[PDB]
Amino acid sequence: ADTIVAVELDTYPNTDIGDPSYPHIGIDIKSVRSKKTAKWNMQNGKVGTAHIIYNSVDKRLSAVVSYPNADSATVSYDVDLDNVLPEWVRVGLSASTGLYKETNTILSWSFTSKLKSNSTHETNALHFMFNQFSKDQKDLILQGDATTGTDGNLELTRVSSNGSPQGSSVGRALFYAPVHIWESSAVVASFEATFTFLIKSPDSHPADGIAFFISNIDSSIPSGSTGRLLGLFPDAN
Amino acid sequence: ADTIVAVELDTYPNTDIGDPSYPHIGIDIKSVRSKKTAKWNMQNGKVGTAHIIYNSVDKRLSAVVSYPNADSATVSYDVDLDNVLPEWVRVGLSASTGLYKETNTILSWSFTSKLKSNSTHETNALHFMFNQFSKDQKDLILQGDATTGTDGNLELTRVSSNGSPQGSSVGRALFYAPVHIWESSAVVASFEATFTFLIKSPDSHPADGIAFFISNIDSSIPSGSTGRLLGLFPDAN
Amino acid sequence: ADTIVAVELDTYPNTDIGDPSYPHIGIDIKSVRSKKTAKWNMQNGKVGTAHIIYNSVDKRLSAVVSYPNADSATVSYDVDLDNVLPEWVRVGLSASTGLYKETNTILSWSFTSKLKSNSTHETNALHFMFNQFSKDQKDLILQGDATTGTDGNLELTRVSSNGSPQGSSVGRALFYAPVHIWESSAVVASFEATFTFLIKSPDSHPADGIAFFISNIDSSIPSGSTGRLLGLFPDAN
Amino acid sequence: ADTIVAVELDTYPNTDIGDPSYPHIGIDIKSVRSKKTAKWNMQNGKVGTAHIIYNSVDKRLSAVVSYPNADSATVSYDVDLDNVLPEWVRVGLSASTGLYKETNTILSWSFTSKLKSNSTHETNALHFMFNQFSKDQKDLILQGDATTGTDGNLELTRVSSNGSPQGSSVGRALFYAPVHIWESSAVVASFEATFTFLIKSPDSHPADGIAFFISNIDSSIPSGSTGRLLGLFPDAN
Amino acid sequence: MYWYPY
Amino acid sequence: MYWYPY
Amino acid sequence: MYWYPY
Amino acid sequence: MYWYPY
Ligand SMILES: [Ca+2]
Ligand SMILES: [Ca+2]
Ligand SMILES: [Ca+2]
Ligand SMILES: [Ca+2]
Ligand SMILES: [Mn+2]
Ligand SMILES: [Mn+2]
Ligand SMILES: [Mn+2]
Ligand SMILES: [Mn+2]
Prior knowledge:
heterooctamer, A: mainly beta, Jelly Rolls, eight-stranded antiparallel beta sheet, E: little secondary structure, elongated, binds calcium ion, binds manganese (II) ion, antiviral protein (chains A, B, C, D), Lectin_LegA_CS (chains A, B, C, D), calcium (chains A, B, C, D), mannose-binding (chains A, B, C, D)
């Protein structure tokens, strides 16, 4: 089915499916049950920044999430992405709410992928950077309830006019162009991603989270993947 | 119809449609009859490099073509692209041959577009770089006779197995993702393009040329645009 | 003497030396009397952003200054920098106050210079970006009253503990490494600069301004260049 | 004394000081006796490319050396550079010859360092790229026998007019501006280096090698560091 | 493992 | 030219 | 204008 | 370790 590799910013602890009992960041490899998690001191109402990095030499997917004036949270996982994802993929952001809710607002998003071959001066690269989103963002594939242009931002989940996050919402945004992550002649392959988000909820228990993901180019939101499934997984296995 | 803005590397002088009587580089704005041309000392069999630049402040589209160990050729044209092209466009390369022929080989291609808004640290950007092409280049839209993978290169026009350029050939390659060239809040908008090519012909009179173009996202090769029309224009008006 | 090329953000109108009667941005080529000026709707207390651009093909030095939610100001000047500045230069920022004063705070500063030769894949480049300054910024040459580290910012002119801008102050900051702006084999040479500043004054008439400059590597603050001379020129000729 | 961290491309096996019995690439942390080595199938007369990478999250210094049409060589070492090098450093290239010799020619060199703080959009960066060197390269500190401009290249060790590598030679080239590798507010720090070299020798046993190094800003060639000591270490301890 | 939510 | 300050 | 090909 | 040069 869809091959998913995601770094989740999980705001709601679903202890029955493996979530530690606190908001946390985790690395998901084809399963919502993170292979590795780190405690995340999430701040309701504050704008945060997440950095995701990986390279084919060290074979380690790492993520660093921070808020201004606070200590960051980090989580790493040794995994060879060549053995998990296809040659061509699509990168995106996903978010959902269930019985509980929060806004899943993205203010900016940047991604860089480089493949260096065994040739002199040969490097294939792709880099995009969104610091403001438009109502008609042709270079993005919006799925579910995701929309753009609301104050130049990307709203992954439904938000009513009065600025209230709706529940049972799921939305994803994928960059239009496929991304080449593996090439036979590459000696070094690497990608870096960064995005600033604003999670806000009128409740003491916001849910469910935001995830940066990499999937097969033809990925679609799995049916019933609202809430704890973050719009990425069809079930909790 | 299709809105075309192109920098042509015209190898064959079709004096009846306005071409000066020598290979030349020109700036075409919706017409094959260049608004401005410069003499080009084209070198059959040598790898050349073309740089195309423009910014919304100076409103001047310039191009510089050079070969190693030789003096370059340059041509500029004051034009406000906002008044010619739509907000969203697609960039690509086009080439053709007619009664005369040449290979229209692209070894590498890079493009960078930046839009700076009136905000602090707000810049939207897109950059791609191909130093080697694959047989299955998913992030490129191939049109006509264009193919990829032949020794990691992009062949815009038909070349037989024995390395011979075929006549009456036309092909184009467009980057998969649309490109945003104008935004209401942008204070500075700019793009830079660069590509290395290898034009080779067994004849003393190669034809017809290579052109870097910007068009409406839905552009297709006009019928009968082989030869002198470079796969860009439907007629010579 | 020192060769100076500067884009000035002049906050005080010294009509006797050529200043229009209003805050303005101008292009100075070896003289404080700008060769070209544009009206600048300066905002006391707001953080602004200036973009400076130039390339050897168009030979036009342009500058765009903007504040969030406001229309920008722009000024251009056709000048061949090869005929004004030496091969190697140093870039920096300068500021001063005289009888009147203001803070001349720099929050971030970025500079990029590229030289493309007539070779395949040959580009010489330098790029630096400061988003936060340290008390010991070894890669910067501080001159006059300029200091770094005060809340991660660069204070070009004296500011007392209580946050009050001192008068008769002059300070400059130059990037440590010389910058190569011309090479015999270059076919395209270009630079782009950007910086965010915070000009603040307790008075209705702040003075004197901030200027991004390019000079001979050995440039020093001219004696008596406080006030209207912006720490760049020895006299008003 | 001088703090040295280097990735050596060792062409001569000095088995008595720990070198494996074959040309190899190694990671040196304050000692010529590499903490880790990899077999290197060095090609006399061919232009190679080395990529050096590291980031503060994974804390792993890796290097990949390759030649066109050949399989690359890689070596990694888990080391926290914050615990070895000072806050401010200088990066460079070093080379030497002893009783045996080879040319230690650098055709291009690029370096990128980034420090991302816990702030929104705050990144401090430095990047330089040399694709051609000049006789008067003001942004480089040449030490020993290193010279620039010979066909736009950097010759780390003495080469006679007839293109013959001299023995008992040592030379280094350091980038003029210090490099900030650590900042208190940084959440992610990283650097990437790349250089193409041409090692050529008229003998069957070339010596001694090329090394990319990072040292205290005031580093100088240790006395008697010719030959096996690569111009980096004072002794073989 | 775990069971005390936030 | 000019003479009315701001 | 022009008419002498190359 | 090692002792056979190249
Ligand atoms: Ca959860
Ligand atoms: Ca023609
Ligand atoms: Ca003034
Ligand atoms: Ca050795
Ligand atoms: Mn979880
Ligand atoms: Mn023409
Ligand atoms: Mn003025
Ligand atoms: Mn060794």
